[PDB]
């Protein structure tokens, strides 16, 4: 994004906090090169010269204005992807009711009752529950008023910069690279869900290579589906971006919103409008108000879907900008936000695509260090996706999502107080695919103090999850 204005105002929107994460018993055993992100400039771990807001907004180094020709190409790619998307999902894209937007529907989680309400409510000491009845799925007069402004396209708002309390590599922690959540007003999230939540629900339910989206997938179940699909192709590329969300140019965002969320695909006219309010945004950090043109705000509602859609269009765009005769069946891919796996039988020169991604303001690099850039010949078993490898389970012959042990060690080394038992059961679901020896080793520090699921129990759970028929078939003989 391009920072076009910065000004100081009277109202100080607080951003500095103390971490809720503490080391666990596993920290002393694994000693990970990971720690809680700095949530304050006074944090002693920070390097000299580090000012949080400067580092946080340093990713905004311009809004790439695409040529007329490139925008035309982009719109064709956006429309072609949209065509695939709405062919698979259908056109049942009318607004959710206020009740449905709050309470959720099949394939769309309910709204969080006690997360940050955003501005100006945070400054007024009003929590989300003061504005919305999450039990009954109704809204108070303030939100009702705001919804009318959105209906009339007169609604304006500021985003609240919220520091992400999370574990990061210590290199990034000390550099002040604390990630953020751009907290939009609760009514904006509500209306966005009203406008495109039905579409988002359908995206989740139809996740896969066909629509190029893994959003709403269950890695336990879907690694078999994804792994088997990508194993059929000669080439598989693990592509990485740098600041994917920040570098979405306004042209790309606008054109995507225009082609994907058209009224002819069942959307209300304000679906495009409310999405377009994400393009030029004002961000509150303490007394500073920073206006950014371009880039996707780091939200938690429709952000992953939007980023996933753009990722799909980018690949089509880049390939078509370099090669002639490129269509959606020239390659295959799946994406979750910035994360992406691409495959094709064609020897696609991904190194040569670099400048074409650059015309979108995006910088692509291979997942591995840089073996003289991108290369052909890699398979599904070489790549990572959602921090998970595609490994073959010897017991079943199904693909399983295997996380690196150092990742799991880092995850296990920290936790929010009072949540550890819950976290361990969750992480056990991730760790089971590493095998019984590694599973045992990872949870050994917690044995006795907490209930650790048996490897056996999680393996059997997984077998049925990935293939119920296989689980059944194993009981045919004594
Ligand atoms: Mn990657």
UniProtKB/Swiss-Prot annotation:
Domain of life: Viruses
Domain RdRp catalytic: 234-352
Residues forming the catalytic site: 338 (for rdrp activity)
Sequence motif Nuclear localization signal, location on chain: 16-24
Subcellular location: Host cytoplasmic vesicle membrane
Effect ascribed to mutating residue 20 to A/E: Decreased the transport to the nucleus of 3D and 3CD. Severely impaired virus infectivity. Impaired RNA binding
Membrane protein topology class: Peripheral membrane protein
Catalyzed chemical reaction(s): RNA(n) + a ribonucleoside 5'-triphosphate = RNA(n+1) + diphosphate
Subunit structure: Interacts with 3B-1; this interaction allows 3B-1 to binds 2 polymerases and act as a primer. It also allows the recruitment of the RNA-dependent RNA polymerase to host membranes. Interacts with 3B-2; this interaction allows 3B-2 to act as a primer. Interacts with 3B-3; this interaction allows 3B-3 to act as a primer.
Protein name: RNA-directed RNA polymerase 3D-POL
Organism the protein comes from: Foot-and-mouth disease virus (isolate -/Spain/S8c1SantaPau/1970 serotype C) (FMDV)
Entire protein: shown range: 1858 to 2327 of 2327
């Amino acid at each position: 994004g391009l920072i076009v204005d910065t000004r100081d105002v009277e109202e100080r929107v607080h951003v500095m906090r103390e971490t809720k994460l503490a080391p666990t018993v596993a920290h002393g055993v694994f000693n990970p090169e990971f720690g809680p992100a700095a949530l304050s400039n006074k944090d002693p771990r920070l390097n000299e010269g580090v000012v949080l807001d400067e580092v946080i907004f340093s990713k905004h180094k311009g809004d790439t204005k695409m040529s007329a020709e490139d925008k035309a190409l982009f719109r064709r790619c956006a429309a072609d992807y949209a065509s695939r998307l709405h062919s698979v999902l259908g056109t049942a894209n009318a607004p959710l009711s206020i009740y449905e937007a709050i309470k959720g529907v099949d394939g769309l989680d309910a709204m969080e009752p006690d997360t940050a309400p955003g501005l100006p409510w945070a400054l007024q000491g009003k929590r989300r529950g003061a504005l919305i009845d999450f039990e009954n799925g109704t809204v108070g007069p303030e939100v009702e008023a705001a919804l009318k402004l959105m209906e009339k396209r007169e609604y304006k708002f500021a985003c609240q910069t919220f520091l992400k309390d999370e574990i990061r590599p210590m290199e990034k922690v000390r550099a002040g690279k604390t990630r953020i959540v751009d907290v939009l007003p609760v009514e904006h999230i509500l209306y966005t869900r009203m406008m495109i939540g039905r579409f988002c629900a359908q995206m989740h339910s139809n996740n896969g290579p066909q629509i190029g989206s893994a959003v709403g997938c269950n890695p336990d179940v879907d690694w078999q589906r994804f792994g088997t699909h990508f194993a059929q192709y000669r080439n598989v590329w693990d592509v990485d971006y740098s600041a994917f969300d920040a570098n979405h140019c306004s042209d790309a965002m606008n054109i995507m919103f225009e082609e994907v969320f058209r009224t002819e695909f069942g959307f209300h006219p304000n679906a495009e409008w409310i999405l377009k309010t994400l393009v030029n945004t004002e961000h509150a950090y303490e007394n500073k108000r920073i206006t950014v043109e371009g880039g996707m705000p780091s939200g938690c509602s429709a952000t992953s879907i939007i980023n996933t859609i753009l990722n799909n269009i980018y690949v089509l765009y880049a390939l078509r900008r370099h090669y002639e005769g490129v269509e959606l069946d020239t390659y295959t891919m799946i994406s979750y936000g910035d994360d992406i796996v691409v495959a094709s039988d064609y020897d696609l020169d991904f190194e040569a695509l670099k400048p074409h991604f650059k015309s979108l303001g995006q910088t692509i690099t291979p997942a591995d260090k840089s073996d003289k850039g991108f290369v052909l010949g890699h398979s599904i078993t070489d790549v990572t996706f959602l921090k998970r490898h595609f490994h073959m389970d010897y017991g079943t012959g199904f693909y399983k999502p295997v996380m690196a042990s150092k990742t799991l060690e880092a995850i296990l080394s920290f936790a929010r107080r009072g949540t550890i038992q819950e976290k361990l059961i969750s992480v056990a679901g991730l760790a089971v695919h590493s095998g019984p020896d590694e599973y045992r080793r990872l949870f050994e520090p917690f044995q006795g103090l907490f209930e650790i699921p048996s490897y056996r129990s999680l393996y059997l759970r997984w077998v049925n999850a990935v293939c119920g028929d296989a689980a059944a078939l194993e009981h045919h003989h004594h």
